Structure 1
């Protein structure tokens, strides 16, 4: 369910998807991770659909009675809130050789696990939840560890990878961002 609160668990289907579909989704994510971890930003950008919404909300620290205010809602400030056009600009920056935050480039590893797939009513469209561990190191000694969950809408596509990312919502397991920037893609 697309509008499930990010505080609440993913709405997995009654029974798990087929072996074949699980394999294809996982293999797509592994290939996506390969592109990012080897700085193939143009190839990675090709996987983003024309109607992509790339969104990472701000998480807050709340006590018992106001836990419904944990996530800063849509239509407010966020870490990422992007379209195909704005992501294009980000990619232009990353491949410019003038992006000082990423020149010298960061060494990254996108660990992809806990992949749960749900088949949506539109044929070829899937809602997918996954856990991630993003290890980032740069220059001499800087190390930043990111963990969390991604909730994607994926569509079957005629590209070599077989899929395109239609929507991406990133749950980051941090309130205050502990890194100096978010100069890496999730």
Structure 2
């Protein structure tokens, strides 16, 4: 239970992370992740309230580890990643930040609400993704590394044309 100076550091860490992403600083962002990274975006289906879960088992929108997340960044560093070249303009609005102690000392369970705004080109339209991110952050030196993230979107059918952006 409790934190305080830690809440501040974790919160600032989230805002710095989001800033790197919104600046297209993917290589720098990749330095924030852990060697055992698990990064997942589940699929949801509409179900009656009675259902125990509406999260799909065995299939996912995205299920990355450190190696595949490196591939993702390496792709964006070529001259040919057409989905993001020209780059989207994006904004990661990170709100409702909750911090809890993790399963080990030096680990923290971090939950935030994300609204991701996205435009491309000169067409007068925009996309919004809304969802909850559940993270495990690990102390590393005088900062943190992300060991785990689950992005659960408030959508079943996703309302953007690809998931070319890291959330």
If the TM-score is normalised by the length of the shorter chain, which range does it land in?
over 0.9
* Aligned equivalents of 2:80, 2:7: Cα separation in 1: 39
Is residue 23 from structure 1 mapped to residue 5 from structure 2 by the alignment? no
Aligned: 1:70 with 2:54: yes
Q: Which residue of 2 aligns with 1:149?
A: 132
TM-score by structure 2 length?
0.95
State TM-score, norm by structure 1.
0.85
The answer to whether residue 130 in structure 2 is matched with residue 178 in structure 1 is no
Q: How does 1:120-159 map to 2 (within 5 A)?
A: 120-141=102-123, 142-158=125-141
CA RMSD of aligned residues (A): 1.3
Moved over 6 A (4+): none
Find the partner of 1:86 among 29, 45, 68: 68
Tell me how far 1:121 sits from its aligned partner.
4.2
Number of residue pairs matched by the alignment: 166
Cα separation, 2, equivalents of 1:38 and 1:97: 18
List gaps (5 residues or longer) in structure 1: 1-12
Q: Which runs of 5+ in 2 are unaligned?
A: none
Q: Distance in 1 between matches of 2:108 and 2:4?
A: 15
Higher strand share: 2
